[PDB]
Amino acid sequence: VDALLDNGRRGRAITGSNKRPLKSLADMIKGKQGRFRQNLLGKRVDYSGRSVITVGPYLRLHQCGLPKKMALELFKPFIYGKLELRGLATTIKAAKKMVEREEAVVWDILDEVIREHPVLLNRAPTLHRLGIQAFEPVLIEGKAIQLHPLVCAAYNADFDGDQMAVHVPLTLEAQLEARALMMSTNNILSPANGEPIIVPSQDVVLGLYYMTRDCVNAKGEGMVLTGPKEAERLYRSGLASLHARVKVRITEYEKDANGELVAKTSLKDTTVGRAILWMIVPKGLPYSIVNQALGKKAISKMLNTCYRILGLKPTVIFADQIMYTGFAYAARSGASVGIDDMVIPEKKHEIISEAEAEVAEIQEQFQSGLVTAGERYNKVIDIWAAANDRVSKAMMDNLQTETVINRDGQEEKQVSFNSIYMMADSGARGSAAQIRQLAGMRGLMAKPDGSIIETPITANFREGLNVLQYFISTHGARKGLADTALKTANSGYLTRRLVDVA
Amino acid sequence: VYSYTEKKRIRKDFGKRPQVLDVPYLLSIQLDSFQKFIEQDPEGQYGLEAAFRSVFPIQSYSGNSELQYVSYRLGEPVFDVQECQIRGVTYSAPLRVKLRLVIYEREAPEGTVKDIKEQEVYMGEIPLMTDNGTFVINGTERVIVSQLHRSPGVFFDSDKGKTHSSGKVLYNARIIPYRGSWLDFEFDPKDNLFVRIDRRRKLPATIILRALNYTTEQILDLFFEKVIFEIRDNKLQMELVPERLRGETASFDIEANGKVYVEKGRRITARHIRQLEKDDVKLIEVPVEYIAGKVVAKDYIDESTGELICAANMELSLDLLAKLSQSGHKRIETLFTNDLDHGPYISETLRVDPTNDRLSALVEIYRMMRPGEPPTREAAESLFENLFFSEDRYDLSAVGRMKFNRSLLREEIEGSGILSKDDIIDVMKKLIDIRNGKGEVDDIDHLGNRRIRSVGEMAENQFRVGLVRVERAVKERLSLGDLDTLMPQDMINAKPISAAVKEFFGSSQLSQFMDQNNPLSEITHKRRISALGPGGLTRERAGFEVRDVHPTHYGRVCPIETPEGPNIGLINSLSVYAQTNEYGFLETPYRKVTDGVVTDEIHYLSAIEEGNYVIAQANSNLDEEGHFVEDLVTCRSKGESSLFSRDQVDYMDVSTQQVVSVGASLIPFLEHDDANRALMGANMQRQAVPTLRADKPLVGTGMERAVAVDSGVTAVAKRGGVVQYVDASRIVIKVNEDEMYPGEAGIDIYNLTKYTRSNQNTCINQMPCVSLGEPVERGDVLADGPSTDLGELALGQNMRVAFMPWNGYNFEDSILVSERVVQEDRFTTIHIQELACVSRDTKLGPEEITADIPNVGEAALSKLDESGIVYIGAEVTGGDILVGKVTPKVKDSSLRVPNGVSGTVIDVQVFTRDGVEKDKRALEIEEMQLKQAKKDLSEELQILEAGLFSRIRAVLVAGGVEAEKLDKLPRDRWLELGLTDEEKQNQLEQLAEQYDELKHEFEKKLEAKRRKITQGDDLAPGVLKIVKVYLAVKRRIQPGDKMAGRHGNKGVISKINPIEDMPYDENGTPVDIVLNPLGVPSRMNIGQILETHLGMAAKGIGDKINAMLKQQQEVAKLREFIQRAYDLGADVRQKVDLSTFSDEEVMRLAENLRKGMPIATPVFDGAKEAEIKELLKLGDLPTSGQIRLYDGRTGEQFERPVTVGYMYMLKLNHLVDDKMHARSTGSYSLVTQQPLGGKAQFGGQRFGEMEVWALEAYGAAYTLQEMLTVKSDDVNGRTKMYKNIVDGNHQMEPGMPESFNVLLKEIRSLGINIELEDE
Amino acid sequence: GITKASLATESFISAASFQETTRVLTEAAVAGKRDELRGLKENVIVGRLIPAGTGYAYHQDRMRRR
RNA sequence: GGCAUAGUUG
DNA sequence: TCTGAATTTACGGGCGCAACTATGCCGGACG
DNA sequence: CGTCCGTTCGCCCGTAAATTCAGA
Ligand SMILES: [Mg+2]
């Protein structure tokens, strides 16, 4: 009886099928696979599907691309209802046969029942409430869902093989909750802080950084433009560079009155690309918002100011337009990555030689008995850190001012048009640390015990690491992978406890 | 030179360093392990011989009889490997054992026994390993994964700071046997020694010493030194050892011979120690306060009372000394318990424990082991004697004994299997020494402390486990035996051994389903070293210590190839050159360095041996004689990389690839990839799907041929010769006379395996790569299997790639693919699926496979034959009826194609139980199969006869040659010929005898094949007949399919762009694939950019050759350009020459190179950037590797020239049509009326707990309510909701979930009354 | 702490669906506890409107019309 | 269609 | 020699989510 | 074939019980 009620609590859990402790009543009502956490708190639902997500950049922020077959299978009761309503099937068996043969008329029915019926898209680790959002379906001739690029940050979804699930809100209250509460156009700001959550991620920011930029001398430098339209007409016809310093006439609207837009026209000294982008910015924002280089934080604060001044609908339209123009001009830039874009400093070899000479002299100072082992270890670690910092500084300077361009007189320094540097500086992808390992030495590595190694990896990834350096890097990478795997469980347990307490 | 298979297409090798050791047979571990399991071992060390000698002879508890052992034998397998896979049986061989039973009568210890009887008894079957290292267990193909467990022996650990909350490290010692109980000694914060057996209750350590019949005084004499107090005159002048005086505080004045060595109160100095040593000090006077804390060593008695005055191990005080003063005892032995170097741990353990005599120790141990049972002296003695000291219940293997002797600094390495008193004593002494401060604990993750269990070793352990039960049954039966009536056939029960071995091979954590979708996948599943399994760790327990990479993994375990996820670092993969030691440890090769010259001899060093040496790195520059060019070379001495002298070096790495495995050595430019990205690249290279045609990586590493050949998927020629016949499914080779054995002629027939299903539902299909009349040599590929091109591994296809953003269609990680890729059908893959229809003997009537089906029309049944089984070649789609079957009540239960699945039926197999009167289609299949078998046998016989007559004619050209009238007589009448007297006529007679033997064996085998084809089939109990239909779907490409590369660059296809929309260069060629440049900085896999540039260079060479070849030019210019291309390199060592190709191999080579020049970039000795620039400059390509590209749509040029090249893209086995699923309404589970799970069952997505939280965070109360009541488990609610949706009214009745009622019933099923009280 | 505070709740169903189902159910059975299911997890388990979003009006209505 | 095992995906 | 506080020790709780594929099985033993 | 009944080996923490101080 004690084994029936709770098998194994007393001890010596009885087994029935090849040494496997069988599930008793307590085991069926408790644990991760009981009734509470497996069949009551979370359930399997009907009218649900799952598929691999793709990009579909053409989508508007409120809609997602749903495959035709998934939509046909998800909305089968609605299709039956409409077929019977229109007199195409007196009984439900005829409607079922018409749908399973996929006749030419069930597709019009599907298109007219999809019209304004939201679907809930959800990615598997629903960490926060933005992990499930309602979109309007767009029927797609394919088998993969098309997810709007802006919502990827909210979903934490890349497109390396992720899958997302679609749920169909059936009742009218569910549809209106999806449209009024869970719509992707209502979730502009993150619920954890005030910052927006639809910030353009990586290609849009690269396109907007390349477009809103300047060089010391380009095609059509200093010519006077009558407005953004003339700037676009000049760039598209090849008569002027995208980033060329010109004077344009900007008419910006300031709403410092009692909600009334007050015009103000001036001659702004800007670039062609900045005017072309100004063609997108809505009426309420000042022109200073696009007169900078427009990295990632700049675009984030631009969207934040647009939301704070103009509201929701203008902000959504502005975000869609920003994404469109950023993709367009990132494609137009042709911003590639080469093997020559990772410029190795010419002073790296001499810095490494100085560091090796210093470690040799410290070894000489130690073998003579002047210093102990611990202080020698500390001195070596500090001098290698200093050498690594000098190498990083040299490479960063050489990539920041990589370009020295002039043909009308004196040479002038300008911010480099290097591909790697632009991708790092714009905030699109990468950082100082990664670009550092690309070109400069990747620096000190730590043993699995946690202690730092005296000898660092003096080789970047443009050069080839030998066997020992790669082995030490494998130490470091395996430690990080294991830590991530064993840290996800702790974070999940903590957030479950936080949810349950509050 | 090259042997005509490496002379068709020479891969340009950019490897600077010269190779020393050839890459071994990569499947050596599995084959070598299993070979020493079945093969006969006269010494009896390995295999079934060891098990039989360990178990047999079998006696009884009394001296009645004895069943001994003679030999064993493996019979011929009943079914071939192909037949075994087709039928579904296990591929095994019957194990027949000769046994002699002897009977002992009254007083016959040495006399003749009553009767002896030897018969070949049969005890089970053992599955056999195929020639590729795999097993066939139930028609599927499985691999037994080698296990990396903790080596038997003694280990010492610390438990540094997880206890006592004070930083005081403990010191435990564990004695792990190969088969037995664990003995653990431990310390505590109070510094008392404790012991435990099988990790039970912690009882004091000296209990086991007493159980070994050791008294207290001898225990103290064994674990301590003796201080002697002699009362010569007075004040107890103590005999003193001058060495014992270093490290303590002198409480008195150490003076002797008028020379005060140590003053009062002051400590002992080293100067005074030297003075005492050189002054020959033996006895010194002591005060009275010194003895007050000392402990007496042994016992003493008084002369008056005659009884004990002071027991051993008791602190001496003034009272004890006074009492022994009058007894007459002058010599007193005491323990030397130093505070910091010789602790009194055994003394405190003797104090704490309550045991005083041996019987008390044994009863305490019996009570600990068996709790609550009434203990007995005899039972306790037997239990302790069989715990560690019986060869049945405890056995340290040879490895256990070796490690035990090594860890105790013993001399010999061979000893007894069981423990002894001295072994436990030495373990305790070593643990005490570790506690005191001398010595260090061992590291468990060290590869010198972890063995390699393999398939043979585990199989023989399971065989021993099975034999133990049979031995017990035979021992029991020998006491109830009708001795002079029976042979040892009914004595042996063949069911337990066979059941144990089948349980191990079929259902085990290591005998796992083979990952067969790629030659690399198979060859890396066989070389898999898992730390889990029986006797190993578990992924929920181990952590942070076995997961990470250890410094002894260099050359033995791959650091980058490990599955990321639940078990990272537990499923390590064997390195390229790593072998298994004689004792099971992993060892790696090294080139010996005796003098400054690096000797060309190879020594295999394990982890412990390698620990004390200096091994120069593989990338050490050498001259022709062999010397380190630099005066300071980078080496590693003791798990630590550093810089060492030119002379000190003792060993060098054999090759630069020896640190990585066979999956990570196929990545060109691995040294430029970040470790995480390289790990992902290897793990995804394992998952490439074999496309329609392999495409020979332009940028390889040179390991492609080794991986393709060593894994068995090609048809490597066994003996060299001349190709005689080549069709799609068969190759015939006429062996050269030099390689032809004296006797049989003597030609090879290779039956290619055409389209067949793999374990992953992919296509296995061997294609001939040789033409008719083409010479081949030994070891050349004749047919390339799946993912193989001319014997080189070829997983994906190499396509023209451009790195540039393209309108967001490669936004985050996506790929952009042109329509040219899908038009050329180059990523199109064939997937073969097997669908089974079974007719089961159910109640209310059996199931028939007739074509008479109700509820369907004749257009639906038109694709079936008269017997209700679809024709071979019918293009069935989703919903079509494959196999017509009805079940009695009649209702339609026919096997139909699953929805969404198309394809062509390529092969239909019918399995019929004996005596079920197979239908017409089964008869047709079996008669056509028998005709095919007869055709194959006749064709092989006539091919062999053509070869035999060719050899006879070649012999007949010398010594009486007849060519005019030889054909006048029939070619069969060659027995009555005319010839002289020599051995040639004897050879002719030998050929005739072998021909007669061929005829007889052909008749016998034809009868055997007819019997094996016409017979019934052993089906499952209750099934009448099984019909299996093999569809062959063809998956081309679509937005959603995940493609990848070799450097961890993933990405799902997002759009199939039109051919004219893709970017194109100045020549008009569009790029096949557009990738995102932004994935390179963050994920530091720079190796893909270098692969792109080098592939662009290779394709430029190929385009130059194609231009020079399509408009015909002389061979002189062609060979000049090819030689210039092959001579391009800084210090490369390939050095191929073209003056020896004879103008017809240059043309063939140039024809093979016109689609690009294959290039080998070794894994760490690869092509430098400067060489890539030079090779680009050899063509008409820019040095920077970037060309200006024009937009396809607008036509305007992209500024910022983009990186174009050729990247070797792979198509992983994650297809969107296998991932897409949707469900409106379907089946529901039984216990809870919730939708089923998965997609094989038409199941529903799990709106889990976090999704419920996410809806709660919104205001979506109605969406959540319909999610967890109406759409999941409210039966009335969901029926009403479906009716309302069909009626056009979207409104739900809430109801109450059925799972809540289930929970209520389950809680009420305990003694708990839970109810829903009234409103 | 969060786990101790989430186990020492006046509603025993939340604590049972959290960790330690056996102990919580034993305590609730012995003490004869009564659960008003006035939280968010209890109404999910029971299968009615959550008293947070659009269901807050329904719960207020059922309190006013009790 | 339930469990277990093994592998894989994010 | 009794009795309360503090310490130590043994023991029960917990240890992310979603998805796919495969095999083995549900039991080994008398009429 | 038809039937038919009996394997220790992880980490962390809270909590109750056993043990040991430390008196008067
Ligand atoms: Mg992802």
PDB file of C-alpha atoms (C1' of nucleotides) and ligand atoms in Angstrom, chain A residues 123 156-158 160 162, chain D residues 10, ligand 1:
ATOM      1  CA  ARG A 123       8.662  31.048 -30.351  1.00  0.00           C
ATOM      2  CA  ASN A 156      15.031  36.636 -30.042  1.00  0.00           C
ATOM      3  CA  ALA A 157      14.644  34.771 -33.334  1.00  0.00           C
ATOM      4  CA  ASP A 158      17.326  34.503 -35.975  1.00  0.00           C
ATOM      5  CA  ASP A 160      19.361  29.736 -38.796  1.00  0.00           C
ATOM      6  CA  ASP A 162      14.249  28.420 -35.839  1.00  0.00           C
TER       7      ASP A 162
ATOM      8  C1'   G D  10      16.530  26.451 -31.742  1.00  0.00           C
TER       9        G D  10
HETATM   10 MG    MG G   1      17.746  30.593 -33.583  1.00  0.00          MG
END
